[PDB]
């Protein structure tokens, strides 16, 4: 599934991401934009044998189990396939875990490089939230 910005902003808000650990809603929408282009099916391979999965490109090295990332962790206690669902619930809950574990949103490369210190509110303006 591919979200529009306002659609994703609404879903994320419903899932309690707005101001989660101090990060306003637009940060989460912006991160999803540059990580996955709002695509729940997005996957990207890493040089360490891990894979980044789903709307927020959560990786199999630390956060989920894909059965093909030797020696990795599964700190969100989920199959990586759950991060590829049309329903963003697993992705959102795992992202909360990543952030609340003390990693910040800085965990997300694309967010750090393209969202942090920008007008992230642009991502939600004009939406009917
Ligand atoms: O894209 S929109 O934000 O305009 C939208 C609004 C409503 C919708 O019903 C939908 C989209 C369709 C829809 C989408 C999704 S999602 O893309 O996966 O996020 C999920 C649902 C859904 O009907 C199912 C659903 C989930 C939840 S949740 O437990 O909070 O995630 C709540 C609802 C759902 O229908 C109720 C609901 C809340 C809201 S509100 O944003 O809280 O006002 C709007 C609409 C609702 O149907 C009314
Ligand atoms: O990720 S967070 O938004 O939670 C965060 C907030 C602050 C932080 O200090 C950091 C993270 C740590 C941090 C990370 C990095 S990174 O490697 O690029 O991820 C860089 C810095 C940093 O403190 C250094 C730094 C850079 C910049 S920049 O010119 O925009 O690149 C600004 C600042 C920095 O400390 C000041 C600053 C701005 C911001 S703001 O989000 O732009 O308002 C938050 C915090 C800040 O310390 C307060
Ligand atoms: Cl915002
Ligand atoms: Mg990425
Ligand atoms: Na893993």
UniProtKB/Swiss-Prot annotation:
Disulfide bonds join 6-127, 30-115, 64-80, 76-94. In the egg white and polymorphonuclear leukocytes. Keywords: Allergen, Antimicrobial, Bacteriolytic enzyme, Disulfide bond, Glycosidase, Hydrolase, Secreted, Signal. Residues 2-129 form the C-type lysozyme domain. The keyword Hydrolase applies. Pfam families: Lys. The active site is at 35, 52. One of its GO terms (cellular component) is extracellular space. GO terms for biological process: cell wall macromolecule catabolic process; defense response to bacterium; defense response to Gram-negative bacterium; defense response to Gram-positive bacterium; killing of cells of another organism. It is found in: Secreted. The keyword Transmembrane does not apply. Its EC number is 3.2.1.17. InterPro entries: Glyco_hydro_22, Glyco_hydro_22_CS, Glyco_hydro_22_lys, Lysozyme-like_dom_sf. Coiled coil: none annotated. It comes from the Eukaryota. Its main location: secreted. It is an enzyme of class 3 (hydrolase). One of its GO terms (molecular function) is identical protein binding. Lysozymes have primarily a bacteriolytic function; those in tissues and body fluids are associated with the monocyte-macrophage system and enhance the activity of immunoagents. Has bacteriolytic activity against M.luteus. Monomer. Belongs to the glycosyl hydrolase 22 family. This is Lysozyme C. The gene is LYZ.
